[PDB]
Write an enzyme that holds these catalytic residues in place. Structure first.
Site, PDB file in Angstrom:
ATOM      1  N   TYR A   1      67.608  19.095  22.956  1.00 61.67           N
ATOM      2  CA  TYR A   1      66.331  18.495  23.297  1.00 61.67           C
ATOM      3  C   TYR A   1      66.142  17.194  22.522  1.00 61.67           C
ATOM      4  CZ  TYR A   1      64.547  20.750  19.000  1.00 61.67           C
ATOM      5  OH  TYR A   1      64.349  21.159  17.702  1.00 61.67           O
TER       6      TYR A   1
ATOM      7  N   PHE B   1      59.270  12.613  17.353  1.00 59.40           N
ATOM      8  CA  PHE B   1      58.977  13.522  16.261  1.00 59.40           C
ATOM      9  C   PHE B   1      60.065  14.548  16.004  1.00 59.40           C
ATOM     10  CE2 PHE B   1      57.884  17.877  17.625  1.00 59.40           C
ATOM     11  CZ  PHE B   1      58.014  17.736  18.990  1.00 59.40           C
ATOM     12  N   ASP B   2      60.910  14.853  16.984  1.00 56.38           N
ATOM     13  CA  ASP B   2      61.959  15.833  16.765  1.00 56.38           C
ATOM     14  C   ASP B   2      63.155  15.473  17.631  1.00 56.38           C
ATOM     15  OD1 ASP B   2      63.474  18.051  16.055  1.00 56.38           O
ATOM     16  OD2 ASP B   2      62.093  19.529  16.885  1.00 56.38           O
TER      17      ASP B   2
ATOM     18  N   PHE C   1      59.778  16.019  26.363  1.00 52.53           N
ATOM     19  CA  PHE C   1      61.072  16.474  25.881  1.00 52.53           C
ATOM     20  C   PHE C   1      62.171  15.946  26.788  1.00 52.53           C
ATOM     21  CE2 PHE C   1      58.133  19.636  24.272  1.00 52.53           C
ATOM     22  CZ  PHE C   1      58.534  19.748  22.959  1.00 52.53           C
TER      23      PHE C   1
END
Lengths: 903, 128, 107
Positions: C26, C36-37, C99
């Site tokens: 992802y 953020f990720d 995502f």
């Protein structure tokens, strides 16, 4: 609040050297077509998705400097308003992605066909994936400048350019009316693939710092001759109206007699046996007297240029004769030279330049006429399509055709000179083609400030590949980026374009160089001297002194520095490898001098002056401008009053000024569906915010613009008006028309303050100050304005996630110019309740110290990244096209300032 | 040695400027002849800076600096200070004979490493 | 509440059924575009077990609708996301997520 970090990929761009554009009377066709083949695309070469976009870019602001930039870096096509691009799923313009329906939509995969159709007559760029239409077209975009193909990519891609003809195949059928882009190549240049505007390229012995590149303009495709109508024909010219025509009636015919194109009595001109040397009486009468009045027309061009005639010596008619040569002998009515014969006659350089521009004014009238009959340029000749390879202005023509035009009229002016009539040069007027952009002329290069030296003796080299305006020397660390070297006291520099030394002015020293020269620069911080040595020989002043400068104070210290003008290439060698130096052993080695980077592992960091305008705060020490913070009284809101410090005095700086506030306002992510006492239940729920500017008396509203700018505005125009504001419309529909989306994208949303004043007879200095107010609804993205408390017909609607900085562009015309009033309206919150999260429920105006006025500095310093991408540009074949290949990945750690949206 | 004698004989200095003033020896053309050929008041009457003895001495100095090795710089300093303490050429020679081992060491300074790497790369250098 | 748009289609046949774990790369992003990720940054696949709800509802359902080898984009409403409380110190409350999921393998 806190500055964010990330790892991003380096992104570069590649273009074919094909330039098209639209202009009034332009010799260029307004529709073009090119194709891109995708060979291999690695999905995720690094942690970040691989970048690849194809589109059109504008030559006057698409400047993709590697590394940092707008948004989160890796800027390419579509990241600004000077480019428009497509990636397989999005339409990129102004660093915003917008999805597009496609027949089997996806990102650009291997073996994909990208056909970009450009129309300039009506503003429109259409994309076609795999030969199938893509339902989205850019529209209503500015046309100034030239449009060229471009592909922006990250590492690990192989893309091929298909340009039709011999430069591709197109693998499909272009839409009707769109010519292959390979037909736009100018006759003086060949086709090749080169990167966009750069400052460094690899060289044999090292990287070459490359100055600004001269860019062609649309204005250079309009042929602008001198009008040859309003000229009364003089007596001394009608007196010589005949011989100068007789000598140009078969001058083009003289060359080919006694060859395969040898005349015959049965036929006439244009029948592969053209000459007919007899006379023009045998030749048809209309073209005959046409040739007479074309000789007169050349004399009229001489008049309009500034040529006048005077008779002194013996009449050439007596001492001239006709020579019946053995060559050019004919059976049709005797033999004679095809033009009128002439004896030994010469021509001075004034006549050479004059006949050059005379041929120029012949070519540009011919080209003007052809354009007026509809014709245009194409590198391959198409007579039924009415296109020619020579419909370009004379300055852009090829040397073969230049010489061919100049030969005939050179013979003509020679025949004129033979009769002794003077060819008088006109007066000389020095002119500059481009004047406004004085900053896109030089590009300072210097070492990083950490390499500051304050003792010892240092030496470095600077090979001069070109011979133009390049300056090399030493500078103090606080050197300004927008000021030419030597013009201030911060640098000691040697200009070897003509042998001058610059420090607070110029005086002659040494000699100018030529190509291949290695200008070695000493420095002696003990003896306080700077010595310039050329090819191992010390440059000598025009006195007994052998050192260029002496008694230089240490101060902060010195850095090696060099600057390059347009079209300049220079190699700088600080001497990381001592054996690489070519003249250190000859000069410097025995004197105790050392290379500047004698013992260093990594290459020395270099900082250059980036020519990209950025908003920076107003310095408190600024000489011309000052910003005063006014406290908000009980009846007056807090203000940011701007006042011109030196207005009305000697050496006052009066020029275009761009201002903005330091903090933006951001619209809501989701738009909404479908006395003077404020209402407490409305003032808390309202999503409307207001601010006003009070343009003081004595400032002309015709030079004031008020509104908002997005954080990607980078236009520094000295002649700004609402015309220059970049804009573009994104039009979206289904497969068969049915346009269901038409949005507006722009980096500037302001009104012109000159339109809010009633056109009074005189007295534009209004005793009452114009109070332009602006309003925003963060729930809808709607912008309104109030001229004096009354609404204006203008209104703006923008997409969500938008950031708007309060901006004012103004040309000062008074001591007190403008005053940012941070007030409020009835049931409407102030700006100070919008920019700060903690202030969202406070109606009382505030002016916290973070809020301040910022100007737009045109040039700023920057850093050259230590490693650049490796791109291969070569022609794979006659059918394959041009192949671009980049494989090695590079990653840079980006620091992104949140509220300014730049990294 | 010609310059050594000229420096020692200040009497010879006196008629050096006497010859300059009485023959109008400009001394500017003798150094700017190359400058004029390449298309590039205060002390015009006489100046030590325009003296042709020192001007030629300076113009020949890099050749003389090419004689010694970089490690000899300490030896040059020792000989220089003994010359400053009024010693003849024989005295400083046998002083160097007493101080033969006082040359520099390449391990003690990184500068000497690149100096030797450039100095001993010359074709005319003989290591013996 | 979850919306999935394809980016690079895979097979479109073998869908992730219950009983086999899902393996993904992802790349989470906030709505405004602030990443953020990511999983490639950590340089390891994220094998999450479908059925016992080790991830949020939006991510689970979006990964369910994908196919083997497919690269897709999501849009997680706060209702099917962390919601009113958010993820303390990472995701602000009431935030819509995006995502860049690639379903590289099954188990």
């Amino acid at each position: 609040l806190l500055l964010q970090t990330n790892l991003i990929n380096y992104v570069t761009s590649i273009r074919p050297n094909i330039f098209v554009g639209r202009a009034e009377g332009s010799t260029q066709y307004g529709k073009w077509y090119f194709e891109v083949m995708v060979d291999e695309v690695v999905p995720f070469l690094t942690a970040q998705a691989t970048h690849l976009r194809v589109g059109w870019a504008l030559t006057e602001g698409y400047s993709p400097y590697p590394g940092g930039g707008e948004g989160w870096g890796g800027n390419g096509v579509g990241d600004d308003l000077y480019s428009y691009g497509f990636d397989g799923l999005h339409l990129w313009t102004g660093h915003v992605a917008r999805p597009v329906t496609s027949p089997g939509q996806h990102l650009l995969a291997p073996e994909d066909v990208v056909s970009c159709c450009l129309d300039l007559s009506v503003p429109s760029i259409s994309f076609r994936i795999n030969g199938c239409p893509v339902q989205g077209v850019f529209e209503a975009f500015n046309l100034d400048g030239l449009f060229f193909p471009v592909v922006s990519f990250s590492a690990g891609v192989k893309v091929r350019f298909l340009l039709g003809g011999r430069h591709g195949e197109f693998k499909f059928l272009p839409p009707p009316g769109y010519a292959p882009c390979h037909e736009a190549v100018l006759p003086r240049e060949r086709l090749r693939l080169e990167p966009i505007k750069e400052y460094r390229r690899e060289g044999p012995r090292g990287p070459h710092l490359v100055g600004p590149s001269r860019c062609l303009s649309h204005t250079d495709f309009v042929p602008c001759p001198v009008d040859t109508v309003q000229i009364v024909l003089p007596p001394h010219l009608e007196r010589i109206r005949e011989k100068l025509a007789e000598n140009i009636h078969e001058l083009w015919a003289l060359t080919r007699i006694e060859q395969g194109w040898t005349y015959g009595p049965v036929r006439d001109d244009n029948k592969r046996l053209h000459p007919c040397l007899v006379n023009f009486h045998s030749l048809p009468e209309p073209e005959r007297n046409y040739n007479l009045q074309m000789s007169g027309e050349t004399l009229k061009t001489l008049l309009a240029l500034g040529c006048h005639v005077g008779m002194a010596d013996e009449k050439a008619e007596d001492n001239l004769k006709k020579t019946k040569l053995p060559k050019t002998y004919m059976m049709s009515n005797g033999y004679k030279p095809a033009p009128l014969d002439l004896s030994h006659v010469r021509l001075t350089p004034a006549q050479t330049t004059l006949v050059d521009r005379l041929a120029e004014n012949g070519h540009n009238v011919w080209a003007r006429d052809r354009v007026a009959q509809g014709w245009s340029y194409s590198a391959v000749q198409d007579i039924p399509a009415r296109r020619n390879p020579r419909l370009v202005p004379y300055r852009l023509l090829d040397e073969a055709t230049k010489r061919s035009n100049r030969d005939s009229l050179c013979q003509a002016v020679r025949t004129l000179l033979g009769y002794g009539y003077n060819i008088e040069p006109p007066d000389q007027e020095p002119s500059q083609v481009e004047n406004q952009s004085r900053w896109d002329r030089v590009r300072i290069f210097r070492a990083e400030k950490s390499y500051t030296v304050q003792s010892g003796r240092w030496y470095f080299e600077f090979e001069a590949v070109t011979t133009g305006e390049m300056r090399v020397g030493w500078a103090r660390p606080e050197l300004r980026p927008d000021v030419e070297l030597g013009a201030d006291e911060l640098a000691y520099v040697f200009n070897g374009h003509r042998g001058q030394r610059w420090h607070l002015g110029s005086e002659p020293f040494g000699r100018p160089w030529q190509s291949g020269d290695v200008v070695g620069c000493m420095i002696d911080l003990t003896e306080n001297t700077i010595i310039f040595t050329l090819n191992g020989e010390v440059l000598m002043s025009d006195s007994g002194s052998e050192t260029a400068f002496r008694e230089i104070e240490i101060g902060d210290g010195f850095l090696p520095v060099c600057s390059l003008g347009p079209g300049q290439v220079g190699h700088l060698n600080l001497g990381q490898d001592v054996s690489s130096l070519r003249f250190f052993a000859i000069c410097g080695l025995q004197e105790g001098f050392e290379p500047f980077a004698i013992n260093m592992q990594r290459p020395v960091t270099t900082w250059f002056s980036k020519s990209l305008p950025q908003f920076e705060p107003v310095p408190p020490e600024h000489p011309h401008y000052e910003v005063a913070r006014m406290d908000g009284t009980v009846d007056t809101p807090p203000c940011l009053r701007l006042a011109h410090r030196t207005w009305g005095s000697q050496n006052s700086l009066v020029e275009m000024l761009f201002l903005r506030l330091s903090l933006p306002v951001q619209f809501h992510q989701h738009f909404r569906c479908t006395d003077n006492r404020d209402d407490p239940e409305i003032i808390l729920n309202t999503t409307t915010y207001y601010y006003s500017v009070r343009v003081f008396a004595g400032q002309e509203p015709s030079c004031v613009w008020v509104g908002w700018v997005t954080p990607d505005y980078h236009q520094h125009d000295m002649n700004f008006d609402l015309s220059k504001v970049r804009a573009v419309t994104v039009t979206m529909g289904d497969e068969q028309g049915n346009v269901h989306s038409s949005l507006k994208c722009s980096n500037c949303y302001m009104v012109w303050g000159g339109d809010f004043v009633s056109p009074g007879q005189q007295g534009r200095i209004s005793h009452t100050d114009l109070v332009i107010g602006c309003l925003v609804d963060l729930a809808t993205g709607l912008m309104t304005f109030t001229a004096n408390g009354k609404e204006s017909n203008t209104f703006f609607q923008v997409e969500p996630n938008t950031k708007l900085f309060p901006a004012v562009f103004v040309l000062p015309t008074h001591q007190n110019v403008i005053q940012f009033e941070l007030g409020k309206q009835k049931n409407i919150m102030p700006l100070s309740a919008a920019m700060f999260l903690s202030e969202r429920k406070n109606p009382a105006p505030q002016c916290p110290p973070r809020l301040e006025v910022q100007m737009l500095m045109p040039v700023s310093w920057s850093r050259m990244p230590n490693h650049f991408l490796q791109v291969e540009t070569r022609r794979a074949g006659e059918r394959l096209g041009w192949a671009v290949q980049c494989q090695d990945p590079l990653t840079m750690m980006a620091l992104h300032i949140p509220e300014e949206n730049r990294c | 040695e010609i310059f050594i004698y000229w420096s020692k004989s200040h009497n010879f200095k006196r008629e050096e400027q006497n010859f300059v003033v009485q023959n109008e020896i400009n001394n500017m053309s003798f150094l700017t002849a190359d400058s004029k050929s390449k298309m590039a008041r205060r002390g015009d009457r006489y100046s030590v800076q325009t003296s042709l003895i020192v001007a030629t001495l300076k113009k020949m100095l890099p050749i003389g600096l090419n004689m010694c090795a970089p490690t000899d710089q300490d030896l040059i300093m020792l000989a220089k200070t003994r010359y400053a303490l009024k010693d003849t050429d024989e005295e400083v020679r046998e002083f160097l004979q007493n101080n033969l081992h006082l040359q520099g060491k390449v391990e003690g300074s990184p500068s000497l490493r690149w100096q030797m790497a450039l100095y001993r790369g010359l074709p005319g250098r003989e290591e013996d | 509440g979850v919306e999935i748009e394809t980016i690079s289609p895979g097979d479109g046949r073998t869908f992730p059924k219950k009983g086999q774990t899902c393996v993904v790369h992802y790349t989470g992003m906030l709505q405004n575009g602030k990443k953020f990720d990511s999983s490639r940054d950590r340089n390891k696949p994220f094998k999450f077990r479908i059925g016992k709800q080790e991830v949020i509802k939006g991510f689970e359902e979006g990964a369910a609708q994908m196919s083997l080898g497919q690269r897709a984009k999501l849009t997680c409403t706060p209702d099917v996301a962390y919601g009113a409380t958010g993820h303390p110190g990472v995701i602000p409350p009431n935030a819509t997520l995006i995502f860049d999921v690639e379903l590289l393998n099954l188990e």
